[PDB]
Nucleic acid binder design. Structure first.
Ligand SMILES: [Mg+2]
Ligand SMILES: [Mg+2]
Ligand SMILES: [Mg+2]
Ligand SMILES: [Mg+2]
Lengths: 48, 55, 290, 43, 31
RNA sequence: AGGAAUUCCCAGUAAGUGCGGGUCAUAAGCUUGCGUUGAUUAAGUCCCUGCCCUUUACACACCGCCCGUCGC
RNA sequence: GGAAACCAGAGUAUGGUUGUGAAACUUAAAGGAAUUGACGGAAGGGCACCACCAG
């Protein structure tokens, strides 16, 4: 439990555990340029 | 044809191809000191280029 | 009118029950039709009742409506009439939320935004149905940032629940100017699964039919069950080269609920699909893509 | 309840043997249906 | 040119000469 | 009792007040429902800032040709 | 006399196998099409708590 272990002990323990759900994606310039490429291709083809 | 091409003598590789004039180019010559050349074509114009920077 | 609305809903649910029977009834018909068209033994499951299928097949013609689909019944006037969208917020909105609701009006052609005061949730749905409002949007906020979105189709249409992730508004960006406000072209990308076809339909029918030469572009892009909303206008400087300038808000969506009823019927409507996060394989599964 | 469960078990093995026995008979009937294809148009 | 496709469409066009009522009984007989 | 600038708002609307819930997402000094009391001004023009379109169903009546450039 | 005789088959589904240079160079439509193409001005009709007016 919490009382037995010293304070802030787990910060250096390097334990292994699992996460419930996927983390939200992070927006970056590389995503923006890739997404603009998809729109640009469809505009040229007029594939509305 | 309107293009002008720069080639390396060591291996015969084309560095660049430029639009240059709007008609056939008539004459070409480098400046003596550096890699800058002058060109003339049937488009009433004279242009100079930097062979290193392709500009 | 109240009796009419109750009467129509029972017809809507009743037709939904037999859509599976009619698809099964139809599918066995072509196998017999294929069996007669190319001389081959009729399948033994169709060996009985084969003549009955032939009589109905001979009755079959272009005049009949055909097999019923619940999606078509919900979105009956999707093409023929332009949608009418009403946008409202939760009670006691923040300053930044009232900015966000002001922007969604400009995004959707013909949308109107009304002040939410002390109006109960039930009364809004009643008023919207009376005046022919096609779609209703409700938006939530947390600490000045919008966090939830609900899209409801008023004539007993599906209700879709969304949560926003990365919201950037035009009011943050200085000196943008004014929007094109024309009827937009829609770009839908990444929706591959059957449910993905369902969700993209709800988002598409919020918009009217645009013109051919319209320069306004709205993009819904799906990447790992997260839908990206982007708004662009393009100018053709010359052939094969196009410039894109971004206008309008930028935000992400995550669907977790679709209910058959309207947002006045949380207590009675069935759930078409829900996101279940506590399944053992929840982290490693996606639903909008195949 | 225990009796009824045991009765279902006999039926499952019974239906399993029923399928195999009819399988030999079915192929002979299938051969007859081939002849009806060639005479389907004629009469 | 496939006879099996050709034979049937010839057969269908042949029956129509008899009449609509004769169509029903012959098509019933076929199935 | 909160300057310069700047944001929002037309009827049970603005504003004040209390009482619940935590609902398979989001939410803890936050988030959402429910009710009570309930206003001032406005129902119209393109003057500024802009947006969407146009300038080729012959009742009566009314009206009677938008302009310019470069290419082929 | 006719076998307890006589003689000596289709459907789906899941997998496999197969069926002299265009760059080292070029965003000038590899250098286009056009009686069919590319732009600009003015005027008229509407509209907006992304504009005025009154609060
Ligand atoms: Mg208030
Ligand atoms: Mg109130
Ligand atoms: Mg103050
Ligand atoms: Mg309160």
């Amino acid at each position: 439990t919490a009382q037995k272990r010293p304070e802030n002990s787990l910060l250096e323990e390097t334990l292994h555990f699992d996460h419930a759900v996927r983390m939200a994606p992070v927006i970056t310039e590389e995503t923006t340029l890739q997404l603009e490429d998809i729109i640009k291709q469809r505009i040229r083809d007029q594939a509305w | 044809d309107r293009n002008v091409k720069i080639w390396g003598l060591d291996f015969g590789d084309c560095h660049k191809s430029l639009f240059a004039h709007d008609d056939s180019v008539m004459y070409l010559q480098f400046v003596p000191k550096s890699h800058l050349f002058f060109t003339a074509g049937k488009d009433h114009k004279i242009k100079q280029w930097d062979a290193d920077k392709f500009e | 009118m109240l009796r009419r609305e109750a009467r129509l809903r029972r017809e809507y649910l009743y037709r939904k029950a037999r859509e599976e029977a009619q698809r099964s009834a139809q599918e066995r018909k072509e196998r017999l039709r294929r069996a007669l068209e190319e001389n081959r033994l009729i399948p033994t499951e169709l060996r009985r009742e084969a003549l009955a299928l032939q009589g109905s097949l001979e009755f079959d013609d272009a005049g009949g409506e055909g097999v019923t689909s619940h999606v078509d019944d919900e979105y009956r006037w999707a093409g023929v009439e332009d949608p009418k969208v009403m946008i409202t917020t939760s009670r006691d909105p923040s300053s930044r939320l009232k900015m966000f609701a002001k922007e969604l009006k400009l995004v959707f052609p013909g949308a109107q935004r009304m002040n939410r005061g002390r109006h109960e949730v039930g009364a809004l749905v009643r008023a919207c149905k009376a005046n022919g409002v096609t779609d209703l949007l409700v938006v939530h906020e947390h600490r000045g940032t919008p966090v939830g979105l609900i899209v409801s189709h008023l004539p007993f249409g599906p209700t879709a629940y969304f949560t926003l992730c990365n919201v950037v508004m035009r009011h943050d960006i200085p000196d943008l100017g004014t929007m094109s406000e024309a009827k937009p072209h829609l770009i839908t990308h990444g929706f591959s699964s059957r449910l993905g076809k369902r969700v993209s339909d709800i988002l598409r029918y919020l918009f009217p039919v645009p013109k051919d030469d319209s320069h306004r572009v709205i993009t819904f892009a799906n990447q790992d069950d997260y839908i990206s909303f982007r708004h662009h206008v393009y100018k053709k400087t010359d052939h094969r080269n196009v410039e894109l300038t971004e206008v309008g808000p930028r935000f992400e969506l995550k669907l977790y609920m679709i209910r058959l009823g309207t947002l006045e019927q949380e207590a009675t409507a069935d759930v078409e699909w829900r996101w279940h996060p506590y399944t053992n394989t929840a982290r490693k599964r996606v639903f909008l893509s195949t | 309840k225990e009796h009824f469960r045991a009765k279902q078990k006999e039926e499952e093995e019974k239906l399993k043997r029923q399928k195999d026995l009819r399988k030999k008979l079915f192929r002979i009937q299938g051969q007859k249906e081939r002849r009806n294809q060639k005479s389907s148009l004629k009469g | 040119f496939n006879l099996e496709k050709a034979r049937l469409e010839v057969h269908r066009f042949g029956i129509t000469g008899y009449g609509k009522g004769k169509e029903r009984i012959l098509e019933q007989e076929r199935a």
